[PDB]
Structures are given as structure tokens and as C-alpha cells.
Amino acid sequence: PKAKRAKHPPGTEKPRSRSQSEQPATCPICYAVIRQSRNLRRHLELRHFAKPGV
DNA sequence: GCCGAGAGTAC
DNA sequence: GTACTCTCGGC
Ligand SMILES: [Zn+2]
Numbered sequence: 001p002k003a004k005r006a007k008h009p010p011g012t013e014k015p016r017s018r019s020q021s022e023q024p025a026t027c028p029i030c031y032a033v034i035r036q037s038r039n040l041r042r043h044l045e046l047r048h049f050a051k052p053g054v
Numbered sequence: 055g056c057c058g059a060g061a062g063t064a065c
Numbered sequence: 066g067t068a069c070t071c072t073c074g075g076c
Contacts, residue, residue, distance in 0.1 A: 004072075005062085015060095039057075039058070065067100
């Protein structure tokens with residue numbers, strides 16, 4: 001239905017207002033270093049809570 | 055296989 | 066006016 005989020009279209013400016021808002025992030029389980037805090041949550045499901053939630 | 059980053063929107 | 070989430074490609 002809605003178009004997908006493609007970063008291919010022209011006029012793709014890279015403002016720091018998207019990276020500046022996030023601060024470095026470390027994993028308390030395997031000390032993995034994730035830069036974006038949002039990505040840190042994803043790391044939890046990838047190398048830790050990646051098991052069935054049931 | 056994981057990682058890193060852009061856009062659209064709400065308050 | 067900021068940060069939020071969802072997505073896509075790259076090595
Ligand atoms: Zn970890």
C-alpha cells in the first residue's frame with residue numbers, strides 16, 4: 001500500500017539532528033558497543049533475547 | 055550474519 | 066523544536 005522507505009531518492013541530506021540525538025551505548029551482558037541507543041535494544045533481541053518469547 | 059544510518063510523526 | 070520508531074543497504 002504505502003511506498004517503502006528508500007534512501008535512494010535524490011536530496012538525501014545527512015543532518016546530525018538524527019545522530020546527535022543518540023549517544024553511545026554499551027550492552028550490560030556482553031559489553032557489545034552499540035552507538036545508537038535504539039540499536040542497543042535491537043542488540044538485546046539479536047545476541048540475548050533472540051529466543052522465543054513463549 | 056551483524057552493524058550503522060535516513061525518513062515520517064507526535065507532543 | 067527534539068527525539069521517537071521503522072526501514073534499507075553494506076562489509
Ligand atoms: Zn550483548
